[PDB]
Design a protein around this ligand. Structure first.
Ligand code: HEC
Length: 99
């Protein structure tokens, strides 16, 4: 994957909530491997799905995310952007979110 492009997109679309792989809103639902595993989402395909459709307090970002209330009120992300993000998150989680 394009690490730098992924990092740039993550840093503007995700980082304020998932700061350095964390979760400033919801303890226990970080992007670290152990939390992803406990939540049943430690795969690229599952990370993509939750990014696309959202879950609870997390908005989803997909073009076809529905209904409006469960999705970002900002611009939707393209499929290719969400794929890049899912690959980036999986890679970072595998690496332990290096600083
Ligand atoms: C705050 C407004 C958020 C933004 C912006 C993004 N995410 Fe998020 N995310 C947020 C919450 C509150 C949660 C927990 C939802 C729940 O009730 O389970 C999540 C969860 C995820 C997960 C799953 C993590 C886990 O179960 O341990 C992933 C993979 C995830 N979020 C990814 C992600 C990406 C790629 C984002 C940018 C496009 C993004 N989130 C934005 C809060 C917020």
């Amino acid at each position: 994957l394009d690490i730098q492009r992924g990092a740039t997109l993550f840093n503007r679309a995700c980082a304020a909530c998932h700061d350095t792989g964390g979760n400033i809103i919801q303890p226990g639902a970080t992007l670290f491997t152990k939390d992803l595993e406990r939540n049943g989402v430690d795969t690229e395909e599952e990370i993509y799905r939750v990014t696309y459709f959202g879950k609870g307090r997390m908005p989803g970002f997909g073009e076809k995310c529905t209904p409006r209330g469960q999705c970002t009120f900002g611009p939707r992300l393209q499929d290719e952007e969400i794929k890049l993000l899912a690959e980036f998150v999986k890679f970072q989680a595998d690496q332990g979110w290096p600083t």
